[PDB]
A paper describes a structure:
Herein, we report the discovery of YJZ5118, a new, potent, and highly selective covalent inhibitor of CDK12/13, by optimization of a structurally distinct reversible inhibitor 2. To address these issues, compound 14k (YJZ5118), incorporating a 4-(dimethylamino)piperidin-1-yl group, was developed. YJZ5118 demonstrated similar CDK12/13 kinase inhibitory activities to 14h, with IC50 values of 39.5 and 26.4 nM, respectively. To confirm that YJZ5118 binds to its target protein in a covalent manner, we incubated the CDK12/CCNK complex with a 5-fold molar excess of the compound for 2 h at room temperature, followed by a liquid chromatograph-mass spectrometer (LC-MS) analysis. A mass shift consistent with the addition of a single molecule of YJZ5118 to CDK12 was observed. The covalent binding mode was further characterized by the co-crystal structure of YJZ5118 with CDK12/CCNK complex at 2.5 Å resolution. The structure revealed that, in addition to two hydrogen bonds formed between the 6-aminonicotinonitrile moiety of YJZ5118 with the hinge residue Met816 and one hydrogen bond formed between the urea group and Asp819, the acrylamide group formed a covalent bond with Cys1039. To further confirm covalent bond formation in cell lysates, we synthesized a biotinylated analog of YJZ5118 (YJZ9149) to pull down covalently bound targets by streptavidin. CDK12 and CDK13 were most enriched proteins in precipitate. Target specificity of YJZ5118 was assessed against the CDK family, showing over 100-fold selectivity for CDK12/13 over other CDK family members, with the exception of CDK7.
Author numbering:
A (entry chain A): 717 to 796, 807 to 887, 890 to 1039
B (entry chain D): 20 to 229, 232 to 259
Write the structure that this text describes.
């Protein structure tokens, strides 16, 4: 409860986990209990407007979300300077796992991964919260088999009963409506990125790999069909619908380019990769699909997760 | 993980300022001067009623763990408002708050800011964040005043006049430690109970039936609680 009083000297920095927005991410261990933690350094010494509003956002969101599939912020610590955000230490991220090539996930593994991720996203959506940065690097996996959702700095409240920022998700997982300029979007942007990682867990490669927005839009349209009023009556309302159009009017061929994945998985992937966000799967009904209906996690086993990398 | 931000009137009589020898009426004026400083500064910059109230709440809580004999009231006030702007998503530059603060205070009042008023406010942000335990999100009686008054059906002019006087009572309550006493829902019904007595209004006639009309808005609120909140608001006019 009393956060911000404990000092960082109670932890020992092992190494650098990564580089976040406010600073670097540090692997550390508690000198009193032995618990591994992740520390986010939030510098304010040099900042012109003191404590970053981006970190203030990330703080007051993660302190409203308590869930097994959402990373829990344990405490906040200072030095005596700067502040450090204490998170429960996860063992891996899905991006680093897939890019290594040393891991192979069974459909039993993917069903367990998707059940936790969709359960955590439904919890955030039920609290009217968009993640707005779902990607493989922000899905954290434990050696016990637990999945968690991380980096809520870009998460924003959603008007349930108003406009927000257009370009918010990394391009490989950004839905077609944001590429076309939608600014009053819905939680459906989050279930789309999870559609890209459901397919990515069966390919070890991101589904839609481009670098420019227009070059991205045709890539999805080459798989899901080009955005048209026939399957998505509101394409005509998005700004860059005419300025940013594919080469030709492609046909949806998702059920065959992914014919190798299980039928229940392919049926869920089609429902989650639909062009029209009004026709897109809800996080609540993703767990009611045939692929995630009867997946009791206590009857599962952790995967082949390695322990060392030429990191 | 959620700390408790409410004190008894016995706890409010043993604040760090009282222990260091300050007079209770002197601390009460320091809170009045400081809260009305975050109020005057906030409107001049065009800030929103939650943003002013959040800065004032930070201010009253800051002086439950620090005494006024160690931390000047106005530097802390300007610091609380600067932090309240970021939390409530209406951020104002600290340089503007001080240029404004200099425009409303004396030569001796602004003297608390030192030679570098900007940094003096910046270094205090760390102390304030630890003091508020990083519990940044707070609720104010404004939203509950509107939320509860919406369910009142009756004379539109009398109901609108009711929430107009209760709104200013929410403004005046921010100069007292009522924020450190009762939840925002209790203050919202208290200012409605107070405004209904000054207007000679019977609120329950705008609810269902006759009656403790607030038992449908807030659970188990004895009248002695509401009449105690009314006293501390009315005493501001003495
Ligand atoms: C020497 C190994 C290392 O620390 N490098 C490292 C590790 C990882 N992570 C991995 O899980 N996967 C890499 C991998 C993949 C396959 C097989 C083995 C290893 C980390 C991912 C984050 C985990 N903890 C975590 C993060 C965030 C929160 C929050 N909130 C909580 N917990 C811990 C494991 C990622 C990146 C890297 N590197 C190595 C190179 C470094 N450069 C050189 C500075 C950057 C990051
Ligand atoms: Mg990240």
């Amino acid at each position: 409860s009393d956060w911000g009083k404990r000092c960082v000297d109670k932890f020992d920095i092992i190494g650098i986990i990564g580089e976040g927005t406010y600073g670097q991410v540090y692997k550390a261990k508690d000198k009193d209990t032995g618990e591994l933690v992740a520390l986010k350094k939030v510098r304010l010494d040099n900042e012109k407007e003191g404590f970053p509003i981006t970190a203030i956002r990330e703080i007051k969101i993660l302190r409203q979300l308590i869930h097994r599939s959402v990373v829990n912020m344990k405490e906040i610590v200072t030095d005596k300077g700067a502040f450090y955000l204490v998170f429960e230490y996860m063992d891996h991220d899905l991006m680093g796992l897939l890019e290594s090539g040393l891991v192979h996930f069974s459909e039993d593994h993917i069903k367990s991964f998707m059940k936790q991720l969709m359960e955590g996203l439904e919890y955030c959506h039920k609290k009217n919260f968009l993640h707005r940065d779902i990607k493989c690097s922000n899905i954290l996996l434990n050696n016990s088999g637990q999945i968690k959702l991380a980096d809520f700095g870009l998460a924003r409240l959603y008007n349930s009963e108003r406009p927000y920022t257009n370009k918010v998700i990394t391009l490989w997982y950004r839905p077609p409506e944001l590429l076309l300029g939608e600014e009053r979007y819905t939680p459906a942007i989050d279930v789309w990125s999870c559609g890209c990682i459901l397919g990515e867990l069966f390919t070890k490669k991101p589904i839609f790999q481009a670098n420019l927005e227009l070059a991205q839009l045709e890539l999805i349209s080459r798989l899901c069909g080009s955005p048209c009023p026939a399957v998505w009556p509101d394409v005509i309302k998005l700004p860059y619908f005419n300025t940013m159009k594919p080469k030709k009017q492609y046909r949806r061929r998702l059920r065959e380019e992914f014919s190798f994945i299980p039928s229940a998985a392919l049926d869920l992937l089609d429902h989650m990769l639909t062009l029209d966000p009004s026709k897109r799967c809800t996080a609540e009904q993703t767990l009611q699909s045939d692929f995630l209906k009867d997946v009791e996690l206590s009857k599962m086993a952790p995967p082949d997760l390695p322990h060392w990398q030429d990191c | 993980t959620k700390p408790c931000w409410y004190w008894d009137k016995k706890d409010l009589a043993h604040t760090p300022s009282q222990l260091e020898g300050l007079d209770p009426a002197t601390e009460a004026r320091y809170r009045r001067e400081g809260a009305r400083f975050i109020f005057d500064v906030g409107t001049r910059l065009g800030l929103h009623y939650d943003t002013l109230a959040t800065g004032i709440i930070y201010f009253h809580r800051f002086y439950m763990f620090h005494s006024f004999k160690q931390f000047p009231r106005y530097v802390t006030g300007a610091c609380c408002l600067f932090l309240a702007g970021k939390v409530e998503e209406t951020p104002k530059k600290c340089k503007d708050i001080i240029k404004t603060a200099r425009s409303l205070l004396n030569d001796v009042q602004f003297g608390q800011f030192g030679d570098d008023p900007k940094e003096e406010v910046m270094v205090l942000e760390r102390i304030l964040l630890q003091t508020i335990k990083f519990d940044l999100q707070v609720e104010h009686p404004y939203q509950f005043l509107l939320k509860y008054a919406k369910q009142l059906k009756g004379d539109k002019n009398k109901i609108q006049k009711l929430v107009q006087m209760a709104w200013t009572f929410v403004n005046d309550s921010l100069c007292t430690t009522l924020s450190l006493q009762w939840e925002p829902e209790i203050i919202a019904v208290a200012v409605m109970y107070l405004a209904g007595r000054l207007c000679k209004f019977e609120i329950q006639e705008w609810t269902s039936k006759p009656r403790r009309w607030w038992e449908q808005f807030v659970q188990d609120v004895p009248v002695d609680v509401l009449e105690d909140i009314c006293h501390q608001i009315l005493d501001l006019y003495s």
